[PDB]
Amino acid sequence: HHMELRELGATGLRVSPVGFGASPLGHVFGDVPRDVARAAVRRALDLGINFFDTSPYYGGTVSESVLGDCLRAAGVPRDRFVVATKCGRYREGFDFSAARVTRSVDESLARLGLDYVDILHCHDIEFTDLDQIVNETIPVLQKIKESGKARFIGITGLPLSIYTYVLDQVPPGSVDVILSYCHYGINDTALVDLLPYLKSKGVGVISASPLAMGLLTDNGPPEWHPAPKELKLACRAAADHCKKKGKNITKLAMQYSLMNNEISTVLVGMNSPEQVEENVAAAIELSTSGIDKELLHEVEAILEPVKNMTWSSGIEQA
Numbered sequence: 001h002h003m004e005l006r007e008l009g010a011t012g013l014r015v016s017p018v019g020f021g022a023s024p025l026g027h028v029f030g031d032v033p034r035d036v037a038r039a040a041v042r043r044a045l046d047l048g049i050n051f052f053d054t055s056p057y058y059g060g061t062v063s064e065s066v067l068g069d070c071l072r073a074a075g076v077p078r079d080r081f082v083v084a085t086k087c088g089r090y091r092e093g094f095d096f097s098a099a100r101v102t103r104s105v106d107e108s109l110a111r112l113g114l115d116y117v118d119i120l121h122c123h124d125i126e127f128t129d130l131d132q133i134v135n136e137t138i139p140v141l142q143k144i145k146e147s148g149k150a151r152f153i154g155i156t157g158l159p160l161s162i163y164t165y166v167l168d169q170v171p172p173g174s175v176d177v178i179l180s181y182c183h184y185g186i187n188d189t190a191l192v193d194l195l196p197y198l199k200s201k202g203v204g205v206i207s208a209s210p211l212a213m214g215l216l217t218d219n220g221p222p223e224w225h226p227a228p229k230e231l232k233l234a235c236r237a238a239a240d241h242c243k244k245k246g247k248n249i250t251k252l253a254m255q256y257s258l259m260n261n262e263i264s265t266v267l268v269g270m271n272s273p274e275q276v277e278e279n280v281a282a283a284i285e286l287s288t289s290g291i292d293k294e295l296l297h298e299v300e301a302i303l304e305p306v307k308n309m310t311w312s313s314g315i316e317q318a
């Protein structure tokens, strides 16, 4: 069994439904040895994952250096995989200006050891005036796209409102994809309200953080996690409910995020071959056998009170 590739917007690209996020929980592949990173990526390639997301932000540009390292190490044709990186967000702060993103793409390419990336996104745009993205950044990224250094252009961020603001205010065709996170998983599925709109605009959809950055795991979220306490407690109840039955919330959550074919890929942060295996397995078992609907229904009931509860991100707008 393979995983069933999905079409990504109007880009032509065919992507694995499970995608590899190269920085889980805001760390470059967690904090695992390089050999383990290299092996996770190797294992991902071997198991039919062909989509890799990174950025110059998490780990101060080392996410990209390590992914570049891991990719060429695995030794596979350039056209066998799809890479996305981002621009605008750096450890030293945000800068979406024309000169910064133009040099950004080159730096990324140098760190990644590639000639082009498949996707370049503007990163977490809720941290700047959204008119700068409309009026400066997107235009510049067209020129980067023209140059060949990126094939397609993306926007990313947390609040779903960034996406209508931008996509309403740029000429049709300016943006190829969006990356949304934390809005397509058992506790939060608000992204669904955008899929028809984005389809109407010819924009492909990538979703990320199907476990909501660790809320839907046995281990629980990191201490920094910005969720309201209510959501944290509800997710702990869901995890405990699965546990007491000898079942795994992580698996249920991954499968759940994969059940909407209008989302082309779900980026999961992964740090080891074992996590790759479990998530690829979860995808395949969904395809071949379906989800556990009875467990899903009970977990849905626990999360019901906190459905689509979110948190603040970015700055005050216009």
Ligand SMILES: NC(=O)c1ccc[n+]([C@@H]2O[C@H](COP(=O)([O-])OP(=O)(O)OC[C@H]3O[C@@H](n4cnc5c(N)ncnc54)[C@H](O)[C@@H]3O)[C@@H](O)[C@H]2O)c1
Binding pocket: 020, 021, 022, 023, 024, 025, 026, 030, 053, 054, 123, 124, 156, 157, 158, 179, 181, 208, 209, 210, 211, 212, 213, 214, 217, 250, 267, 268, 269, 270, 271, 275, 278, 279
């Ligand atoms: N604005 C943006 O563009 C933005 C922001 C957030 C995330 N992302 C992307 O999405 C990716 C995924 O998000 P995330 O990693 O923060 O959150 P997530 O919800 O994907 O959870 C990742 C966590 O779950 C653990 N995990 C994964 N599979 C597991 C399994 N089978 N069993 C047990 N634990 C498992 C990981 O080790 C990690 O701690 C990121 O690496 C990144 O590429 C994009």
Ligand SMILES: [Mg+2]
Binding pocket: 129, 130, 131, 317, 318
């Ligand atoms: Mg404004």
